[PDB]
Write an enzyme that holds these catalytic residues in place. Structure first.
Site, PDB file in Angstrom:
ATOM      1  CB  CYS A  29      -1.070  -0.094   1.403  1.00 47.25           C
ATOM      2  SG  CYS A  29       0.347   0.364   3.165  1.00 47.25           S
ATOM      3  CG  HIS A 197      -4.479   1.071   4.886  1.00 43.69           C
ATOM      4  ND1 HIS A 197      -3.448  -0.502   3.935  1.00 43.69           N
ATOM      5  CD2 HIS A 197      -5.343   1.098   4.170  1.00 43.69           C
ATOM      6  CE1 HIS A 197      -4.024  -0.263   2.317  1.00 43.69           C
ATOM      7  NE2 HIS A 197      -5.196   0.275   2.594  1.00 43.69           N
ATOM      8  CG  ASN A 217      -8.210   0.721   0.253  1.00 41.08           C
ATOM      9  OD1 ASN A 217      -7.000   1.096   0.264  1.00 41.08           O
ATOM     10  ND2 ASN A 217      -8.987  -0.316   1.379  1.00 41.08           N
TER      11      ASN A 217
HETATM   12  C1  LIG Z   1       0.097  -1.263   4.354  1.00 41.50           C
HETATM   13  C2  LIG Z   1      -0.516  -2.453   3.507  1.00 41.50           C
HETATM   14  O1  LIG Z   1      -0.420  -3.206   2.325  1.00 41.50           O
HETATM   15  N1  LIG Z   1      -1.718  -2.492   4.221  1.00 41.50           N
HETATM   16  C3  LIG Z   1      -2.116  -4.026   4.798  1.00 41.50           C
HETATM   17  C4  LIG Z   1      -3.058  -4.822   3.362  1.00 41.50           C
HETATM   18  O2  LIG Z   1      -3.644  -3.952   2.399  1.00 41.50           O
HETATM   19  N2  LIG Z   1      -3.912  -5.946   3.504  1.00 41.50           N
HETATM   20  C5  LIG Z   1      -4.148  -6.327   2.365  1.00 41.50           C
HETATM   21  C6  LIG Z   1      -5.482  -6.174   3.209  1.00 41.50           C
HETATM   22  O3  LIG Z   1      -5.841  -6.269   3.621  1.00 41.50           O
HETATM   23  O4  LIG Z   1      -6.767  -6.732   2.256  1.00 41.50           O
HETATM   24  C7  LIG Z   1      -3.430  -7.926   2.030  1.00 41.50           C
HETATM   25  C8  LIG Z   1      -3.932  -8.967   1.289  1.00 41.50           C
HETATM   26  C9  LIG Z   1      -2.146  -7.688   2.148  1.00 41.50           C
HETATM   27  C10 LIG Z   1      -0.749  -8.133   3.218  1.00 41.50           C
HETATM   28  C11 LIG Z   1      -2.654  -4.414   6.329  1.00 41.50           C
HETATM   29  C12 LIG Z   1      -1.711  -4.208   7.417  1.00 41.50           C
HETATM   30  O5  LIG Z   1      -4.179  -3.214   6.197  1.00 41.50           O
HETATM   31  O6  LIG Z   1       1.727  -2.796   4.877  1.00 41.50           O
HETATM   32  C13 LIG Z   1       1.890  -1.455   4.116  1.00 41.50           C
HETATM   33  C14 LIG Z   1       2.753  -0.414   4.251  1.00 41.50           C
HETATM   34  O7  LIG Z   1       3.404  -0.379   4.280  1.00 41.50           O
HETATM   35  O8  LIG Z   1       2.148  -0.105   5.994  1.00 41.50           O
HETATM   36  C15 LIG Z   1       2.557   0.943   6.261  1.00 41.50           C
HETATM   37  C16 LIG Z   1       1.624   2.571   6.417  1.00 41.50           C
END
Ligand SMILES: *[C@]1(C(=O)N[C@H](C(=O)N[C@H](C(=O)O)[C@@H](C)CC)[C@@H](C)O)O[C@@H]1C(=O)OCC
Length: 251
Positions: A29, A197, A217
């Site tokens: 993200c 996130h 998002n």
């Molecule tokens: C930001 C990040 O990518 N967030 C994670 C995320 O989007 N998770 C998805 C989800 O919940 O659908 C899964 C499919 C992938 C693991 C979670 C932690 O919300 O860790 C990333 C980052 O760089 O955070 C610091 C800002």
């Protein structure tokens, strides 16, 4: 400043502003919020239209931006744009641009026709080449930023930045109740902390007397409100106003 503002309506000639991407099964993200806002700004400040490669950012920045699919630092991503620049690259299997995203789209906390997202996802290799058939070369396809800065945790300053220069990248603490968001203005009331996130803030408004930030998002269009969501504005809710970063494209 106006009571409401939607970058999508204000810059009609910049369709990337309306786009919602899918980071796939990878914690990228940090990279997505960056390339999305960068794509918008390149269009806004160059009236050229370009799908900035999430792949290039995700795979080639390195330690300066964190740890790839393991998470990263937003400000570090904008720095990479100014130091190494970013090539073009569209959605998974789109064959658009120099380096299209290599991680498949998936279902993020929703049911659908795509495979459900998984936590395990390795950072792809940093390949300084473009897909076959694409021109120009990787080096020639780089788009550089000429400034990378951090906007203060100040509602008005953030609104002014968006109003004048376009969408910015931000980050907030995700608690489980956010996962099921569908509509309205999100306000955290329950659920275990999931982690930080990074997202893209492209506007603001007021819904039923509740001020909010218009946010995009990176969990595809079938999550939330067509991929977007609104979150409480003005109280640094979940830290939504605490990590705003942006930058300006060269020339
Ligand atoms: C930001 C990040 O990518 N967030 C994670 C995320 O989007 N998770 C998805 C989800 O919940 O659908 C899964 C499919 C992938 C693991 C979670 C932690 O919300 O860790 C990333 C980052 O760089 O955070 C610091 C800002």
């Amino acid at each position: 400043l106006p009571e409401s503002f939607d970058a999508r309506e204000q810059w009609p000639n910049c369709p990337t502003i309306k786009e919602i991407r899918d980071q796939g099964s990878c914690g990228s993200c940090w990279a997505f919020g960056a390339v999305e806002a960068i794509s918008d700004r390149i269009c806004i400040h160059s009236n050229v239209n370009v799908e900035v490669s999430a792949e290039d950012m995700l795979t080639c920045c390195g330690g300066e931006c964190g740890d790839g699919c393991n998470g990263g630092f937003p400000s570090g991503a904008w720095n990479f744009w100014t130091k190494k620049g970013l090539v073009s690259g569209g959605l998974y299997n789109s064959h658009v641009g120099c380096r299209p995203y290599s991680i498949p789209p998936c279902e993020h906390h929703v049911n659908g026709s795509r495979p459900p997202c998984t936590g395990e996802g390795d950072t792809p290799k940093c390949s300084k080449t473009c897909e076959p058939g694409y021109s120009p070369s990787y080096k020639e396809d780089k788009h550089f930023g000429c400034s990378s800065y951090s906007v203060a945790n100040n509602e008005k300053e953030i609104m002014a930045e968006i109003y004048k220069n376009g969408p910015v990248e931000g980050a907030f603490s995700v608690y489980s109740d956010f996962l099921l968001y569908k509509s309205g203005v999100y306000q955290h009331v329950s659920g275990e902390i999931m982690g930080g996130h990074a997202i893209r803030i492209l506007g603001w408004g007021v819904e039923n007397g509740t001020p909010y930030w218009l946010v995009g998002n990176s969990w595809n269009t079938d999550w939330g409100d067509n991929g977007f969501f609104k979150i409480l504005r003005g109280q640094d809710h979940c830290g939504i106003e605490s990590e705003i970063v942006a930058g300006m494209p060269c020339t």
